[PDB]
Amino acid sequence: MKYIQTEQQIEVPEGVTVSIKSRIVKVVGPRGTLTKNLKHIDVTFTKVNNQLIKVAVHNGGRKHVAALRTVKSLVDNMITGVTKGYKYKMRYVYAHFPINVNIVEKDGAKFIEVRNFLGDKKIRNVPVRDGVTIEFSTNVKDEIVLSGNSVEDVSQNAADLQQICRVRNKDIRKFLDGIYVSHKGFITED
Amino acid sequence: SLAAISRAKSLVEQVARDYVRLLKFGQSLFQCKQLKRAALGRMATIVKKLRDPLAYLEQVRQHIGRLPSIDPNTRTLLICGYPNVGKSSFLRCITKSDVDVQPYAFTTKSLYVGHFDYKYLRFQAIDTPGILMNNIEMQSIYAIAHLRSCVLYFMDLSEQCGFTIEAQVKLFHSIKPLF
Amino acid sequence: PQNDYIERHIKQHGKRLDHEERKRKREARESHKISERAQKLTGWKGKQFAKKRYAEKVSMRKKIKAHEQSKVK
Amino acid sequence: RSKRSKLVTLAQTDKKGRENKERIFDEVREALDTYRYVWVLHLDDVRTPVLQEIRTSWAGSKLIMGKRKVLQKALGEKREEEYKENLYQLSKLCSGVTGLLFTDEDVNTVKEYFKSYVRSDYSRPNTKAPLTFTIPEGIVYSRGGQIPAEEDVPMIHSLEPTMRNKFEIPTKIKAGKITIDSPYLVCTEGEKLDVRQALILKQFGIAASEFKVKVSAYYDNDSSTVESTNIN
RNA sequence: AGCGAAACCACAGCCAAGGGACGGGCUUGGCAGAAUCAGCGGGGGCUUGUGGCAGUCAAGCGGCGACAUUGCUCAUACCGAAGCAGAAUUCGGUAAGCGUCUACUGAU
RNA sequence: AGAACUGGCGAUGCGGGAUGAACCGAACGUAGAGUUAAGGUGCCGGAAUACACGCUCAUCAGACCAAAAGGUGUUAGUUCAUCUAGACAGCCGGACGGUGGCCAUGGAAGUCGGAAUCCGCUAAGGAGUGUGUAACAACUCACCGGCCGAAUGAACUA
């Protein structure tokens, strides 16, 4: 029907503040700050009463309208991250070979090192993105916790850790060594 | 299934001989083309109607290869008695082997082998699926008869399953002539 | 590997830590990949896919029709 | 195109449609002229075998067959729609589960039955557990140790993913038995039960919650009183 | 050193495609050294993978009828699935890799 | 293919068809002036990168019959179902009694198997759609109910 105008609403909690111009979105709050670029999505922002931000598209087609809702989700994720924060828990279980996960600072990159994965001599290094912080879980068996403000950085790092621990052409049922995302909770849950 | 496979192969050979001779004497593209489809047409029909036996073969293939490699010729130790009255856990104790210990009547449905060495000579203990006939029980009957072994009979007196020894003794006499 | 060397591993070990997640995600993605396959897979691949896909829908429709008679009766 | 592909599994049952509501709509109106007293129940949570016991405990008393919002229309939400005098005020006092009792029994009988009646139930969501329980710090069993662990049966491996993922507890499988490294506190008194907390108790079968139908308003076909001897 | 022919000669004689049947002259694009010269000798909007005959039924098309239907007649490498425990292996896809006068070139 | 009839060529220049038998218009003395046929108006190429309404992302698009059907591609419609008694979807609850229905049998308690698929109350519930166990157990849908708040769902045509 080629909607003349489609609008979406984003609730802004009082604890955070957002500044909007040409589509580089910045979010500021107690936990820090986040930045996102939306110049490729061609949406229009508008501050209503400092508590609700309106995103609208004029003459948006079905393909364009579908992209409108994504802006709210990405903006909402940034707002939640600065307020609640995202914590991705993972457990590096193993059958026989103990999986050793450590952090090295070669060139100051704080690379994550995985050793003795299924007895492999090769040492696997996983880079750590900006913003995400690694903290080994205490008194929890073989649990590693990833925390950060940006969902993309925290989530992507968790995916990389699990992906690089792939078993090379072996029976998946019989081989269980690897890293999996046990939980996707928040930092300051309530 | 095996006989049908051989018959299908023979029919396929007949297909080649019949149509190839006809095709090699053709004089038009359509005749050769149409006859070519006829040659391969029967092969599809023969195989298409062979679906039922083929499925059975695959199921047997994926299970027959998984069967334990028990050796009737070498020394073996058969285990028999009332269903899973302590016998199932016995095999794991003798040597490195795994058997379900959860004590329900027929804890084992098929044979097991556990290898151990004594006097520098190899031995392999065998566990029966269980004896109360049932087709599953029939596997043990032939194992007892056609395996060179000294079978061990299992019973309980004070702790396990509290079953009456009278039934076990009476059931023992049923197998007495055979083994 | 006696006989049940992997079915005894589905239990007593679990398939993985998060196994259903991979299977569940793949099943959902199949609906999207089916559309991609139809437009792609030129040549004999498309012809085989089109013929096989048509039979699946025809067979599926027949199953629904048969059930309706049984359900009503 | 590009729409959600609806999925359905073939089953004997089928939707009732609006025609079922029409029979429901007329049922309430008929009851107003057949029975003497009218009551509205607020049983926000129910158990079908328990409901049958309450329903089968008597024959004259009848639980009205209908839907909450349909009951309002059937009873009449306005003076111009009420089937009987003063009924419209009564209808707008009940909401939620379709709780409503039509009977000829005396008011004293109604209050006595509900007040004395009480039954056990699972700890439903939005409630607070009246007790506390900690799972054993080792291998877990079906009942979680509330009954002697020696008599309890080990938890089946098939339910491990539910505990690990749905309940979020850090469970793991050890030789076919679920194990935990600490005595996880499932719940405690004063906490409002979340769905995960209620499910954990529901899975263990801990029916540590009482259930009784609460009734607020009373009405009659000739007295037309709107008295409410509410009991909670 | 000095002497001194013959055969042949409409004209020129670079490529991909279109030129209906003849491309060597036409057309679309790209080419070409002015000039000279020695060798290796080089020449001299078809198609595939699934049968003939006979018969039931039908999604539909408007009396016809798709598929189902009954009788006989790679060795290499990287990914996804396989009771793939290991080794070895098949299947599907990807790389089609990998195997049982003038062309060229010396020289000015 | 073949019998016959009527037209173009066969003796034929001109413009367009990027070139082209038989395609489109146009049947020719040598000249100047103006309007046109078919073709075109981004450059080669003389003429508007004119206007109006829609339509398409194609990983050689589009301008050049093997196509019946497939595609969670796009756009406008046709026939039906529900709807402020609350349409769709998302969560939560109920999801029952005979009954562990009858038979094979170590076991099929709805969910390895064979014929019925009966019944009472219900708010709606299939001797049960799947997951699931050695058999139980447990989860789920189909079926209703509670919180949400209006259009939604099914098959076809172009």
Swiss-Prot record, chain A:
State its location(s). Cytoplasm
Q: Which UniProt keywords apply?
A: Cytoplasm, Ribonucleoprotein, Ribosomal protein
One Gene Ontology term of the molecular function aspect? structural constituent of ribosome
An example Gene Ontology cellular component term from the record?
Answer: cytosol
Q: Which Pfam families match?
A: Ribosomal_L6
Q: What is its main location?
A: cytoplasm
Q: Name one GO biological process term.
A: cytoplasmic translation
* Function, as annotated: Component of the ribosome, a large ribonucleoprotein complex responsible for the synthesis of proteins in the cell. The small ribosomal subunit (SSU) binds messenger RNAs (mRNAs) and translates the encoded message by selecting cognate aminoacyl-transfer RNA (tRNA) molecules. The large subunit (LSU) contains the ribosomal catalytic site termed the peptidyl transferase center (PTC), which catalyzes the formation of peptide bonds, thereby polymerizing the amino acids delivered by tRNAs into a polypeptide chain.
Similarity annotation: Belongs to the universal ribosomal protein uL6 family.
Recite the other comments: Present with 52400 molecules/cell in log phase SD medium.
Subunit structure and binding partners: Component of the large ribosomal subunit (LSU). Mature yeast ribosomes consist of a small (40S) and a large (60S) subunit. The 40S small subunit contains 1 molecule of ribosomal RNA (18S rRNA) and 33 different proteins (encoded by 57 genes). The large 60S subunit contains 3 rRNA molecules (25S, 5.8S and 5S rRNA) and 46 different proteins (encoded by 81 genes). uL6 lines the binding pocket for eukaryotic elongation factor 2 (eEF2).
Q: What is this protein called?
A: Large ribosomal subunit protein uL6A
From Swiss-Prot, chain B:
Locate the residues binding GTP: 81-88, 127-131
Q: Where in the cell is it found?
A: Nucleus, Nucleolus
Q: Which residues form the OBG-type G domain?
A: 75-179
Relay the record's extra comment: Present with 28000 molecules/cell in log phase SD medium.
Q: Which family does it belong to?
A: Belongs to the TRAFAC class OBG-HflX-like GTPase superfamily. OBG GTPase family. NOG subfamily.
Q: What does this protein do?
A: Involved in the biogenesis of the 60S ribosomal subunit.
- Report quaternary structure and partners: Associated with nucleolar and cytoplasmic pre-60S particles. Directly interacts with RLP24.
Q: Can you say what this protein is called?
A: Nucleolar GTP-binding protein 1
Q: Which organism is it from?
A: Saccharomyces cerevisiae (strain ATCC 204508 / S288c) (Baker's yeast)
UniProtKB/Swiss-Prot annotation, chain C:
Renumbered to this chain, motif Nuclear localization signal 2 spans: 50-57
* Localisation per UniProt entry: Nucleus, Nucleolus
Q: Which domain of life is it from?
A: Eukaryota
* Region of interest: Disordered: 1-42
The short sequence motif called Nuclear localization signal 1 sits at 14-21
Composition-biased stretches (Basic and acidic residues): 1-39
Role description? Involved in the biogenesis of the 60S ribosomal subunit. May play a part in the quality control of pre-60S particles. Under normal, rapid growth conditions, high levels of NSA2 would allow the progression of pre-60S particles through the ITS2 processing.
Q: Which family does it belong to?
A: Belongs to the eukaryotic ribosomal protein eS8 family. Ribosome biogenesis protein NSA2 subfamily.
Subunit description: Component of the pre-66S ribosomal particle. Interacts with NOP7 and RRP1. Interacts with RSA4 (via WD repeats).
Q: Any extra detail in the entry?
A: Present with 8660 molecules/cell in log phase SD medium.
Task: Return the protein name.
Answer: Ribosome biogenesis protein NSA2
- The residues of the intact protein that this chain contains are 2 to 74 of 261
UniProtKB/Swiss-Prot annotation, chain D:
GO biological process: any one? nuclear-transcribed mRNA catabolic process
- Which ranges of the sequence are coiled-coil? none
Keyword Cytoplasm belongs to the record: yes
The compartments listed are: Nucleus, Nucleolus; Cytoplasm
Outcome of swapping residue 66 to D: Bypasses the requirement for phosphatase YVH1 for the release of MRT4
Instruction: Provide this UniProt record's keywords sorted from A to Z.
Output: Cytoplasm, Nucleus, Ribosome biogenesis
One Gene Ontology cellular component annotation?
Answer: cytoplasm
Tell me a Gene Ontology molecular-function term this record carries. large ribosomal subunit rRNA binding
Question: InterPro entries per the record?
Answer: Mrt4, Ribosomal_uL10, Ribosomal_uL10-like_insert, Ribosomal_uL10-like_insert_sf, Ribosomal_uL10-like_sf, Ribosome_Assembly_uL10
- What SUPFAM superfamilies does this protein's entry cite? Ribosomal protein L10-like
Annotated signal sequence range: none
The answer to whether the entry has keyword Nucleus is yes
Specify where it is mainly localized.
Answer: nucleus
Q: Which family does it belong to?
A: Belongs to the universal ribosomal protein uL10 family.
Q: How does it assemble?
A: Associates with the pre-60S ribosomal particle.
Give a short account of what the protein does: Component of the ribosome assembly machinery. Nuclear paralog of the ribosomal protein P0, it binds pre-60S subunits at an early stage of assembly in the nucleolus, and is replaced by P0 in cytoplasmic pre-60S subunits and mature 80S ribosomes.
Q: What else is known?
A: Present with 18200 molecules/cell in log phase SD medium.
From the Swiss-Prot or TrEMBL record, give the protein name: Ribosome assembly factor MRT4
Read off the lineage from the record.
Eukaryota, Fungi, Dikarya, Ascomycota, Saccharomycotina
**Which gene does this sequence derive from?**
MRT4
